[PDB]
Coordinates of C-alpha atoms and ligand atoms in Angstrom, one line a residue:
X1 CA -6.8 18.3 -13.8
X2 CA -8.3 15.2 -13.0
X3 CA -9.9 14.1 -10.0
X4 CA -8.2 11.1 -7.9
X5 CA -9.2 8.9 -5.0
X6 CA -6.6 6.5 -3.9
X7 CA -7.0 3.5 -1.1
X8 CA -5.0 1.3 0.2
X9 CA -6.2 -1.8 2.2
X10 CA -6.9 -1.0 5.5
X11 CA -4.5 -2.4 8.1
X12 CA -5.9 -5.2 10.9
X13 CA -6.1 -3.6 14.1
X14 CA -5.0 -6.5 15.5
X15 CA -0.8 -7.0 14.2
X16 CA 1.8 -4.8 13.9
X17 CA 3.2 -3.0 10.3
X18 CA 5.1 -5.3 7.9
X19 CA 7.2 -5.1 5.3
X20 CA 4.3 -7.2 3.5
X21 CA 2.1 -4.0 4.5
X22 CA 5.2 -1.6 3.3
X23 CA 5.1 -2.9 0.2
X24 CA 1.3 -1.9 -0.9
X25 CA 1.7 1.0 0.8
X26 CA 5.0 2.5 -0.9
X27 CA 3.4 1.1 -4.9
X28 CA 0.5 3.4 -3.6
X29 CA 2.8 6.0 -2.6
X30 CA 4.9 6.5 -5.2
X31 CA 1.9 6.7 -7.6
X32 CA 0.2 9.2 -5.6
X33 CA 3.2 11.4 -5.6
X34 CA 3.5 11.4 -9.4
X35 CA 0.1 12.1 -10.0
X36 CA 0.4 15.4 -7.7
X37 CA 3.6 16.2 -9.7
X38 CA 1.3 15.7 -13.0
X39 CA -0.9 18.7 -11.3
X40 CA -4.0 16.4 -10.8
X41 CA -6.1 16.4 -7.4
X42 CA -5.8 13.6 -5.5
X43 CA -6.9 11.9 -2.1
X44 CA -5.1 9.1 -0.6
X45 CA -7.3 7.7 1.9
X46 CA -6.9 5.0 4.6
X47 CA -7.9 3.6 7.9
X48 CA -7.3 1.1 10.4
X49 CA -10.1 -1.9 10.2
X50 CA -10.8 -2.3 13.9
X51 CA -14.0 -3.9 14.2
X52 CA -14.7 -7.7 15.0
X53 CA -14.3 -10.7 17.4
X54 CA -10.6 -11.2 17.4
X55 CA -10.0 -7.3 18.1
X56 CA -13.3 -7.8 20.8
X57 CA -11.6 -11.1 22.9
X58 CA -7.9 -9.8 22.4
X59 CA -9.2 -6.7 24.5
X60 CA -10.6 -8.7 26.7
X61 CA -7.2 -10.9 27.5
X62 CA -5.9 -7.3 28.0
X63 CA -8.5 -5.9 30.1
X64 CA -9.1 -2.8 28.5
X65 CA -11.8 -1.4 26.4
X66 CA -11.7 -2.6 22.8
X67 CA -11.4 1.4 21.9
X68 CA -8.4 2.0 24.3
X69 CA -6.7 -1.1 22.2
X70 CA -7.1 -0.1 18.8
X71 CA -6.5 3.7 19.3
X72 CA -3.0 2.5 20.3
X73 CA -2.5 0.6 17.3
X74 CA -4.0 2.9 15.2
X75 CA -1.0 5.1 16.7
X76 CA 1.3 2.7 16.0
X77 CA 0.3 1.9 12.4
X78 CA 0.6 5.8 11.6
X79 CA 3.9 6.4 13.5
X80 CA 4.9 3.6 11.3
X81 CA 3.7 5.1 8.0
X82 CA 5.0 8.2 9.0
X83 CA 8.3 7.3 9.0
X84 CA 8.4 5.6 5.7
X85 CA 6.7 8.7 4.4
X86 CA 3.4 7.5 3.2
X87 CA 1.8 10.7 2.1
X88 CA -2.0 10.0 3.4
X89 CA -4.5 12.7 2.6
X90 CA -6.0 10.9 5.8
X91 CA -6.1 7.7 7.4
X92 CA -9.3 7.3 9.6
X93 CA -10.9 4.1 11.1
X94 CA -13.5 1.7 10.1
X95 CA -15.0 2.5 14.2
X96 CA -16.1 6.0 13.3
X97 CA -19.7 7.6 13.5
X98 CA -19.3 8.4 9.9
X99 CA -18.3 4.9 8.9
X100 CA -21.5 3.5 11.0
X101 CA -24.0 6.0 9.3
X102 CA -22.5 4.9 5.6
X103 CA -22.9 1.5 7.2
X104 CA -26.4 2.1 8.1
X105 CA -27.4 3.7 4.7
X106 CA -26.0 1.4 2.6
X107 CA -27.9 -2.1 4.1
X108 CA -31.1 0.1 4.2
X109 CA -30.7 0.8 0.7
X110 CA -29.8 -3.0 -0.3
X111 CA -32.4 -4.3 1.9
X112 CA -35.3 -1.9 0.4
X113 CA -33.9 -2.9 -3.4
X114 CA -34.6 -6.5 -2.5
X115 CA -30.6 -7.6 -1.7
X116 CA -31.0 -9.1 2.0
X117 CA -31.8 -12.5 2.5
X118 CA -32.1 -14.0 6.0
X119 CA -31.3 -17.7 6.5
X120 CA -31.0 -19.6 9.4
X121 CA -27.6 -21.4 10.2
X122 CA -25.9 -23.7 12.6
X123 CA -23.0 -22.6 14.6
X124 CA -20.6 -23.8 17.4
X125 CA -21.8 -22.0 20.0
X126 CA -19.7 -21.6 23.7
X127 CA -22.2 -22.1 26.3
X128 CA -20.5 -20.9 29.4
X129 CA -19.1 -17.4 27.6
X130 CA -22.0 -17.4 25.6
X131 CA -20.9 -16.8 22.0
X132 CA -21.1 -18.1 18.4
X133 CA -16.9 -19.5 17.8
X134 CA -15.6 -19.0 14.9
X135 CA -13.5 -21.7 13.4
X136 CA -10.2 -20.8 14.9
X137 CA -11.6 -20.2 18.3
X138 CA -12.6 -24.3 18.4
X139 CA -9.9 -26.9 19.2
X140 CA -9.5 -30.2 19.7
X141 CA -8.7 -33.6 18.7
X142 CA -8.2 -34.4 14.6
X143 CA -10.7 -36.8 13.3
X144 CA -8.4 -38.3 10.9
X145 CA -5.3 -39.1 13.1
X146 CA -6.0 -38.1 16.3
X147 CA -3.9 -35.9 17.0
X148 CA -4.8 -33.4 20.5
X149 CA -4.6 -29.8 20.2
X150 CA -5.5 -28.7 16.7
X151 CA -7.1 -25.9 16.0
X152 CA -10.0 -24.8 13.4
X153 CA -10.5 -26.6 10.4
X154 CA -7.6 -28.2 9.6
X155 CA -4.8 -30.7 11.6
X156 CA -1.0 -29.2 11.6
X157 CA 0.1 -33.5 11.9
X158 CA -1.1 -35.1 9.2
X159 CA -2.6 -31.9 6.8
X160 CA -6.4 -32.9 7.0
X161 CA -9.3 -30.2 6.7
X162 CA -12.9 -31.0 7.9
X163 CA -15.5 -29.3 9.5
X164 CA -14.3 -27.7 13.0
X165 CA -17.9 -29.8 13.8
X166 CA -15.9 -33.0 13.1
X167 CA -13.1 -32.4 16.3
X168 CA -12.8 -34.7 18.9
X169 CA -13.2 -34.0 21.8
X170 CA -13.7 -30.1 21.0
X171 CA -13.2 -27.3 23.2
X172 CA -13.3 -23.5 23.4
X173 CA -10.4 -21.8 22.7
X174 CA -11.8 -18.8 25.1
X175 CA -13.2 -20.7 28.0
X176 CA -12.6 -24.4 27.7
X177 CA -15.9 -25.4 27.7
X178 CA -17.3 -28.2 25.5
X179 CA -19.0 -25.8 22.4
X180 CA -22.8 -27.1 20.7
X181 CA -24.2 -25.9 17.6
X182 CA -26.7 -23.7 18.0
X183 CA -29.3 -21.8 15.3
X184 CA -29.1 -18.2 14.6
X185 CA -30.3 -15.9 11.7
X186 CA -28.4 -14.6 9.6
X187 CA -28.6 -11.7 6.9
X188 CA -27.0 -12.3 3.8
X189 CA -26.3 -10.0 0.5
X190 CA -27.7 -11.6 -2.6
X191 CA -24.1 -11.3 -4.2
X192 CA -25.4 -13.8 -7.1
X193 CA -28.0 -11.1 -8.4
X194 CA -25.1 -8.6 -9.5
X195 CA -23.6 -11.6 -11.7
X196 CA -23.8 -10.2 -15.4
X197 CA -22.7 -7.0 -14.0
X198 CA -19.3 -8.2 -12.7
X199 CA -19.1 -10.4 -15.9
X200 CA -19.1 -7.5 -18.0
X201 CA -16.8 -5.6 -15.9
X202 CA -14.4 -8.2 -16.1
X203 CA -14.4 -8.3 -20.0
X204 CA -14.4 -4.4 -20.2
X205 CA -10.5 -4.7 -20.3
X206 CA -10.0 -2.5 -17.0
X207 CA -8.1 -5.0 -14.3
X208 CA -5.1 -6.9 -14.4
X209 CA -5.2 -9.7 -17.3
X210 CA -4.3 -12.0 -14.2
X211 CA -7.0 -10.6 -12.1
X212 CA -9.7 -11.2 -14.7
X213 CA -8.6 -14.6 -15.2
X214 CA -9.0 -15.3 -11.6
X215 CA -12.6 -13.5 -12.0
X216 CA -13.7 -16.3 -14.4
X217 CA -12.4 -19.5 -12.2
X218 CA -14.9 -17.6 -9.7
X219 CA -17.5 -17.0 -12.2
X220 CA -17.2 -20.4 -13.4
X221 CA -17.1 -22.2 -9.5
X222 CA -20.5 -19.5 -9.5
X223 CA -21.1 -16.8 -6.8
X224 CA -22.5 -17.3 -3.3
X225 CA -24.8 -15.0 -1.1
X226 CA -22.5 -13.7 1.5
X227 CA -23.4 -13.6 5.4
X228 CA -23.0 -10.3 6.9
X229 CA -24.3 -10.0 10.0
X230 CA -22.7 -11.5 13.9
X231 CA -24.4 -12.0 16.8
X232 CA -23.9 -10.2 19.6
X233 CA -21.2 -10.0 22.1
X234 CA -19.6 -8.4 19.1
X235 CA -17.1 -5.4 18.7
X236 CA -19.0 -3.1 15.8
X237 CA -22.0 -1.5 14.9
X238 CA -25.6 -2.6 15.4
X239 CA -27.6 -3.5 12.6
X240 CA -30.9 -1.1 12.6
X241 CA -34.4 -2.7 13.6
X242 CA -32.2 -6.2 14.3
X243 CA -31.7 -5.9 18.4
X244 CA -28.6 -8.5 19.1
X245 CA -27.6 -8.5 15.4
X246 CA -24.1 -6.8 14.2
X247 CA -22.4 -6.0 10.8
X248 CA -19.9 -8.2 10.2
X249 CA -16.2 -6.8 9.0
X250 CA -16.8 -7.8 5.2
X251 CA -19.9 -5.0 4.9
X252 CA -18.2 -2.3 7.4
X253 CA -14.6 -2.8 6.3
X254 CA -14.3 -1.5 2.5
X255 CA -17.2 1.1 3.7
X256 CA -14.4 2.4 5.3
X257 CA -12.9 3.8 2.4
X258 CA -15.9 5.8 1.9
X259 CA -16.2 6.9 6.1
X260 CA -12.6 8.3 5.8
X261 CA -12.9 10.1 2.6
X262 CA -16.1 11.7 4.8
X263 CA -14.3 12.5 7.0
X264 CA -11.7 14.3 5.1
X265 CA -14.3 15.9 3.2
X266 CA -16.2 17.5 7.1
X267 CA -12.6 18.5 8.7
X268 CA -12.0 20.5 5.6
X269 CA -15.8 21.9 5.6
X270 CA -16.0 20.8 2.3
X271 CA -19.8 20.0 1.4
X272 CA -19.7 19.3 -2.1
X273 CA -16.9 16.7 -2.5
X274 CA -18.3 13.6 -1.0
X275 CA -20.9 13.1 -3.4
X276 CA -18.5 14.5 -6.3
X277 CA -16.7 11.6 -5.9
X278 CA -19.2 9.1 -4.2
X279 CA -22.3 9.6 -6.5
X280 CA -23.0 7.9 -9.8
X281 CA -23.0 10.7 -11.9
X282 CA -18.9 10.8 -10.7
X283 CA -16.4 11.9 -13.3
X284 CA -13.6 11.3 -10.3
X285 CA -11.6 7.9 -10.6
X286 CA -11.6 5.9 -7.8
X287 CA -8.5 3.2 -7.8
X288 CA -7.6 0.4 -5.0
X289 CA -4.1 -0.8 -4.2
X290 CA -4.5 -4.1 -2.9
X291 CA -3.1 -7.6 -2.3
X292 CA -3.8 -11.0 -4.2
X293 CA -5.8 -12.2 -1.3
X294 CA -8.7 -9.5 -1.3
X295 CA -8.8 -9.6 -5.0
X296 CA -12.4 -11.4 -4.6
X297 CA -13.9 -9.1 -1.8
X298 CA -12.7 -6.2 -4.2
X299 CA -13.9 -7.1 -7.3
X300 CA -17.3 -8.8 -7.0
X301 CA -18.4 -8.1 -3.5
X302 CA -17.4 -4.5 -3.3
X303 CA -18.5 -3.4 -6.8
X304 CA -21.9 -5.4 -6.0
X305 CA -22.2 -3.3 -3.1
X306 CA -22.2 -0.2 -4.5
X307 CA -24.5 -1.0 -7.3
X308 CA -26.8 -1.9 -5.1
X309 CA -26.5 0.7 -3.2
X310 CA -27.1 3.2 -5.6
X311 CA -22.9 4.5 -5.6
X312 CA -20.1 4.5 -8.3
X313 CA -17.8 1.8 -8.5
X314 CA -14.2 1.3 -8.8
X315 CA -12.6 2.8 -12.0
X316 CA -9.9 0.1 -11.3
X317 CA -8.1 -2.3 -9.3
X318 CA -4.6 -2.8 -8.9
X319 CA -3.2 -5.9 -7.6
X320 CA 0.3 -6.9 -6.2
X321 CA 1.9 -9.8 -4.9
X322 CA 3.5 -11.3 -2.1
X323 CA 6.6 -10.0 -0.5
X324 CA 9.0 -12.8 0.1
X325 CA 12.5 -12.3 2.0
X326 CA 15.9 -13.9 0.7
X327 CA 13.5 -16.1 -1.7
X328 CA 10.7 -16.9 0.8
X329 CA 7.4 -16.1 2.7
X330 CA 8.5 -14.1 6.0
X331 CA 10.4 -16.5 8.5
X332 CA 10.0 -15.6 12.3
X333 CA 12.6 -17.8 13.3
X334 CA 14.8 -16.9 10.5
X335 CA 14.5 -13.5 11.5
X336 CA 12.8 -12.6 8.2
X337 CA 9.2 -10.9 9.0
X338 CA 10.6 -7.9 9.3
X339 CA 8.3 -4.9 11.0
X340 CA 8.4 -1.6 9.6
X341 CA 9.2 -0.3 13.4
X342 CA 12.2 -2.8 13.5
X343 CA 13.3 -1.0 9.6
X344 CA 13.9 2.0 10.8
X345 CA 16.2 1.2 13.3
X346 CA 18.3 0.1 11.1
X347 CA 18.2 1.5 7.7
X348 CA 16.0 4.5 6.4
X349 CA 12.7 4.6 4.2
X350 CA 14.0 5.3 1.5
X351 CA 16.5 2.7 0.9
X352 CA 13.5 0.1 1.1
X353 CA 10.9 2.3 -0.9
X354 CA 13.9 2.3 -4.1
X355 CA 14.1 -1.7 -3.7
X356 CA 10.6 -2.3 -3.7
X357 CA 10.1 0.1 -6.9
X358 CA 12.8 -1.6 -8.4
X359 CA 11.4 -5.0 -8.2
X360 CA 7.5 -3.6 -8.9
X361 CA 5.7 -4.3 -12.4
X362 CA 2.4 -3.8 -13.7
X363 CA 1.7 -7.7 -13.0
X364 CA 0.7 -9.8 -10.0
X365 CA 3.8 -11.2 -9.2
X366 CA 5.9 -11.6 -6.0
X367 CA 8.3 -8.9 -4.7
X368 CA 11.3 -10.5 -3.5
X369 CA 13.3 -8.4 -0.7
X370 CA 16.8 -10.7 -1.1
X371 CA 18.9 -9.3 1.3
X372 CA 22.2 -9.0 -0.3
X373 CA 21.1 -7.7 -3.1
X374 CA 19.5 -5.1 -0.9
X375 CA 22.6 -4.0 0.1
X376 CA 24.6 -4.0 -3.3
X377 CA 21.6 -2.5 -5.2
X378 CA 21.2 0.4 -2.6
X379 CA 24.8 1.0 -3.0
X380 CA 25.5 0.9 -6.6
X381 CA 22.2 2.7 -7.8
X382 CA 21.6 5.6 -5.4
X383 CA 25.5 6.1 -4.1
X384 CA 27.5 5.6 -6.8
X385 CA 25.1 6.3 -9.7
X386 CA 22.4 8.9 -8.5
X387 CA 24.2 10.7 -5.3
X388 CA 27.8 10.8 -7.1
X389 CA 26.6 13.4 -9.8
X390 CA 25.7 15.7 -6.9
X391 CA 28.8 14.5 -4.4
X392 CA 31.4 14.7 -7.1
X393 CA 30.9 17.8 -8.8
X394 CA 29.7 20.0 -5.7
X395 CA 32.8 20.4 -3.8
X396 CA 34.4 22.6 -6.2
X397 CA 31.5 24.6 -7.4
X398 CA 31.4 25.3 -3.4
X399 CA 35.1 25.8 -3.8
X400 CA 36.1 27.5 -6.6
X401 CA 33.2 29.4 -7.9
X402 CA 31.4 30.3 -4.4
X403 CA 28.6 28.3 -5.4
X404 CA 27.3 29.6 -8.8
X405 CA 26.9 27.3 -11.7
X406 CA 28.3 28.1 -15.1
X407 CA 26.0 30.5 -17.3
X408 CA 25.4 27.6 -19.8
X409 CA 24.6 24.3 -20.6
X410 CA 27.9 22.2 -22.1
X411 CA 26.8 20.2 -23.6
X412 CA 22.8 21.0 -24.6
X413 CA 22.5 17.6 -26.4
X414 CA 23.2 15.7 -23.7
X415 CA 21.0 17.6 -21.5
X416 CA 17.8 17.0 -24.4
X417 CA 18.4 13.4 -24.1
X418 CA 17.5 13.7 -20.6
X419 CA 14.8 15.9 -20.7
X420 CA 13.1 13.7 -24.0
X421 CA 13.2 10.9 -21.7
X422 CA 10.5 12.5 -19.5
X423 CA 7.5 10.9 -21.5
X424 CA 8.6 7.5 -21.5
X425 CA 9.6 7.8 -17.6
X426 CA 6.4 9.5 -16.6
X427 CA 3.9 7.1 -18.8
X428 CA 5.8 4.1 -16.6
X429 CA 5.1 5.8 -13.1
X430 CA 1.3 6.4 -14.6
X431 CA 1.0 2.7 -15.9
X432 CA 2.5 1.5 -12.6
X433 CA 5.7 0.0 -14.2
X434 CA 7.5 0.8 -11.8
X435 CA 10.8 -1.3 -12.8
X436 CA 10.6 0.2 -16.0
X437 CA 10.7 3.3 -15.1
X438 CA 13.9 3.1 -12.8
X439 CA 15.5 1.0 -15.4
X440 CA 15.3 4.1 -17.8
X441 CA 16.3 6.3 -14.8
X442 CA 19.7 4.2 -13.9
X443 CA 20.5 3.6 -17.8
X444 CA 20.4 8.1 -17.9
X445 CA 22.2 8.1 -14.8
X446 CA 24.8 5.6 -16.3
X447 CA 25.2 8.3 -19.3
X448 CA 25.7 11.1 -16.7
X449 CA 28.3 9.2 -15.1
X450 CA 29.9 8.3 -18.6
X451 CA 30.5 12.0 -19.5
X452 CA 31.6 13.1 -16.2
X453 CA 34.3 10.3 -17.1
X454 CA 34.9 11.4 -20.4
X455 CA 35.6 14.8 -19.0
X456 CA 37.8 13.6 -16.3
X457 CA 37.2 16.6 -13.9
X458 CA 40.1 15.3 -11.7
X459 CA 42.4 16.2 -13.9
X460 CA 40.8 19.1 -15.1
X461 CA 40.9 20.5 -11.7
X462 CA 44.6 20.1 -11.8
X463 CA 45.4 21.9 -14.8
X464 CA 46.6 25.4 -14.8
X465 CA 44.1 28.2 -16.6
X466 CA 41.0 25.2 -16.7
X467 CA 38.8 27.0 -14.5
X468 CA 35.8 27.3 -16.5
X469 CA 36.2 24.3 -18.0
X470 CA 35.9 22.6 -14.5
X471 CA 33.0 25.0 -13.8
X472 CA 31.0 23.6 -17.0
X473 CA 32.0 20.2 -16.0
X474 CA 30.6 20.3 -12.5
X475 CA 27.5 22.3 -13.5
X476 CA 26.7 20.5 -16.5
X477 CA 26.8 16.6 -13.7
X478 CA 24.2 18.7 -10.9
X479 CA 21.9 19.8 -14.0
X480 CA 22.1 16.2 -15.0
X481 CA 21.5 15.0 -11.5
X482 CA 18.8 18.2 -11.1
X483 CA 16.8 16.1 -14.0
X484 CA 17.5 12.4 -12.6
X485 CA 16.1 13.7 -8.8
X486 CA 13.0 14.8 -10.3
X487 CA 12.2 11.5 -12.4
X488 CA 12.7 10.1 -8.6
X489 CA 11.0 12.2 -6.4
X490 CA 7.9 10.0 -6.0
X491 CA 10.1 7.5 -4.9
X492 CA 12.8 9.1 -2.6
X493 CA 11.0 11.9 -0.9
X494 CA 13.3 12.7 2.1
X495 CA 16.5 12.1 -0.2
X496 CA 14.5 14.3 -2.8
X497 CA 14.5 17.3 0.3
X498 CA 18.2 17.1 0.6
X499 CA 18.6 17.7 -3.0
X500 CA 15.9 20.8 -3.3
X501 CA 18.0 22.4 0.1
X502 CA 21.5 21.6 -2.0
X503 CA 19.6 23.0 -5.5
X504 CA 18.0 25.8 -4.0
X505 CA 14.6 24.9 -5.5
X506 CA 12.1 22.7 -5.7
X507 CA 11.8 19.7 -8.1
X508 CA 8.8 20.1 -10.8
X509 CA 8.1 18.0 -13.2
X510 CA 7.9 20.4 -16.1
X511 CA 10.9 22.6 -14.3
X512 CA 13.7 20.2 -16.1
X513 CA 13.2 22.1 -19.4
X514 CA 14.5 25.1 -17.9
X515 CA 18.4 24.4 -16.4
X516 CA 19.7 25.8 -13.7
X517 CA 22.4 28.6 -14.8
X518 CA 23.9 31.5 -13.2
X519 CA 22.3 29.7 -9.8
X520 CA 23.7 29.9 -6.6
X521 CA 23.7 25.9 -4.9
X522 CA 24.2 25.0 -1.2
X523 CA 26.9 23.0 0.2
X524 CA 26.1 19.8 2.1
X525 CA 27.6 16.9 4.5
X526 CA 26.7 13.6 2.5
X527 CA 23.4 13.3 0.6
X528 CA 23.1 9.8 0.9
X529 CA 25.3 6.9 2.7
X530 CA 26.7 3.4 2.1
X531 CA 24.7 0.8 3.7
X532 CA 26.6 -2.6 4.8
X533 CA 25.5 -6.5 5.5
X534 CA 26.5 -6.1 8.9
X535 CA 23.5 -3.9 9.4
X536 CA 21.4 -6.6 7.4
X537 CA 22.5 -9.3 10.2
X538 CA 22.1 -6.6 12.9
X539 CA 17.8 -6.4 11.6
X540 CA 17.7 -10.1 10.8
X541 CA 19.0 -10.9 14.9
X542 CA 16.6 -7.8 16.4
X543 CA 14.1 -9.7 14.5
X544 CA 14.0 -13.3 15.5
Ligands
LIG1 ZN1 -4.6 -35.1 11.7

């Protein structure tokens, strides 16, 4: 009965789907989907983050409007999703009228509480396309070794960082002209101000025990104001009463979360639910999936934000790691960063969305897809352990009873171990130990398979006057696997469909305590497929 809105980050308008993306987005998924099987209300919300100088100049290499560009990657990032089956309430875009009126609300609000600071600053300035540069858009020549070509702050020869101001020789990136520092103002959000606020936050015993020990080396290093304003030419939304002046990404971005949820809320002409879930009187949760390298945006800035802005804050953060591939970060020329289009090609969602739950924890730790093991693991949990209750018992139900399962449980005991194990499975999906929970799934699934075994339905089948013995057999394996299907539904939706069709009824949560008995099933071609590594070399060539 509670009240639930979920994020994930919001995907750069400016790259193609990963499996780095895949991963946050399936942990968020398969949460979701439990919490709608525990009967709660929930709205998974996203959005494309579109705004900003890279997404303005790469439309301007492309010579179309920066809205043409990002409405065709917003429809690639959703195709994408789509097919792994990411179960968005909506997914909207930080370029959105309702995104620029939170936008606008929120600085008025933190400016009139005394939380915008202007400050002058220097800045590399292009004189000839007539722009501020940011760092990666100056090159040049590396102080230190002198080295041509190097770009931004740092020198890919000999590993120095400086200043880009420090380049020899430096040139625009866009133009080729010789860039000057020139003075601007800027606005910036008193971050420092919300201090003790965060502080206790971080104590309250809420986040990650990793995430609040990152909090404190931040704490401890001490909080800075933060710019958020850009100069014009700029792709984004005007700042009110500042002519030439934009917001920058880091105020419009997470504000995003809040524009979609808007938006959600108008399309469904629903005028009370926005401020439900938005004001500070909330009793919604509000949760954030996100990666280790927006932990700081999330949990100081973001929070700080809101305070100041007189909204609620995050009930939580939860925080995952890198994915790696065969051990490592994602190798273009090994063929290892893998899109999600380039997946689907050649294996289905939900052979990658069991992996990655596999492998996921509670912690902030990395996810590594190893390829082989992708292969065998796929194979030996979901073929031969999950799939083979349903594939070697339905034939001759189909068969030799004309569909119908037996009238009883044989063996009830068996079948209230499974059904006891519900609590234990369901607090791990809700705790987001995700490992754990599969881990209890495969060791059932291992039983199931062990009295199928012990009851040796091959032979049964062979034996003159054993009908109903065969008929309690096979029944008793697809109640079993009936059970196992629903403790995996949040994580195998589209296998999870074949099985309903085959069952003849859909998968609740609470449904396992009833079994299925005197119940008509379907037949079916194959539930579920071996997978090979000559498909794994087959992605890692279409990727390189
Ligand atoms: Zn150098």
């Amino acid at each position: 009965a509670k009240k639930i809105l979920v994020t994930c980050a919001l995907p750069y308008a400016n790259g193609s789907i990963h499996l780095g993306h895949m991963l946050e987005h399936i942990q968020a998924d398969v949460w979701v989907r439990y919490q709608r099987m525990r009967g709660h209300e929930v709205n998974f919300i996203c959005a494309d983050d579109a705004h900003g100088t890279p997404i303005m100049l790469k439309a301007q290499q492309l010579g179309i409007t920066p809205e043409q560009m990002i409405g065709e990657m917003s429809q690639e990032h959703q195709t994408d999703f789509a097919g792994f089956n990411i179960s968005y309430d909506n997914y909207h875009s930080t370029h959105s009228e309702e995104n620029r009126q939170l936008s606008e609300l929120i600085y008025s609000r933190l400016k009139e509480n005394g939380f915008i600071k202007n400050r002058t600053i220097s800045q590399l300035y292009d004189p000839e396309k007539g722009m501020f540069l940011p760092d990666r858009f100056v090159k040049g020549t590396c102080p230190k070794c002198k080295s041509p070509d190097q770009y931004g702050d740092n020198c890919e020869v000999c590993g120095a960082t400086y200043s880009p101001t420090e380049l020899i020789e430096p040139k625009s990136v866009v133009s080729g002209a010789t860039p000057v520092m020139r003075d601007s103002e800027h606005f910036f959000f008193d971050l420092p101000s919300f201090s003790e606020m965060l502080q206790a936050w971080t104590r309250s015993g809420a986040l990650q025990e990793q995430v609040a020990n990152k909090m404190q080396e931040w704490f401890e290093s001490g909080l800075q104001q933060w710019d958020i304003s850009r100069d014009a030419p700029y792709f984004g939304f005007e700042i009110p009463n500042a002519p030439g002046k934009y917001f920058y990404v880091w105020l419009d971005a997470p504000i995003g979360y809040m524009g979609s949820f808007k938006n959600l809320c108008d399309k469904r002409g629903d005028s009370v639910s926005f401020d439900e879930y938005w004001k500070k009187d909330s009793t919604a949760e509000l949760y954030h999936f996100i990666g280790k390298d927006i932990v700081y945006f999330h949990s100081l800035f973001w929070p700080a934000m809101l305070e100041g802005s007189n909204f609620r804050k995050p009930s939580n953060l939860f925080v995952h790691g890198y994915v790696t591939v065969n051990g490592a970060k994602m190798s273009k020329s090994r063929g290892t960063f893998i899109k999600a289009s380039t997946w689907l090609n050649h294996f289905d969602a939900d052979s990658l969305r069991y992996y990655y739950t596999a492998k996921l924890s509670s912690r902030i730790d990395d996810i590594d897809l190893n390829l082989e093991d992708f292969v065998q693991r796929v194979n030996a949990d979901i073929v031969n352990k999950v799939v083979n209750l349903a594939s070697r018992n339905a034939g001759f139900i189909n068969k030799r009873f004309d569909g119908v399962l037996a009238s009883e449980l044989a063996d009830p005991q068996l079948y209230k171990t499974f059904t006891d194990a519900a609590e234990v499975i369901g607090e791990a999906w809700e705790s987001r130990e995700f490992g754990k929970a599969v881990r209890e799934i495969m060791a059932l699934a291992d039983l199931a398979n062990r009295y199928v075994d012990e009851q040796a339905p091959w032979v049964v089948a062979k034996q003159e006057g054993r009908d109903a013995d065969l008929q309690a057999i096979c029944s008793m394996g697809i109640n079993l696997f009936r059970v196992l299907m629903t403790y995996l539904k949040p994580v195998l939706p589209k296998l999870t469909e074949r099985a309903e069709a085959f069952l003849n009824t859909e998968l609740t949560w609470d449904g396992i305590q009833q079994p299925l008995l005197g119940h008509k099933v379907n037949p079916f071609k194959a539930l579920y497929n071996r997978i090979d590594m000559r498909q794994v070399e087959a992605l890692v060539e279409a990727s390189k």
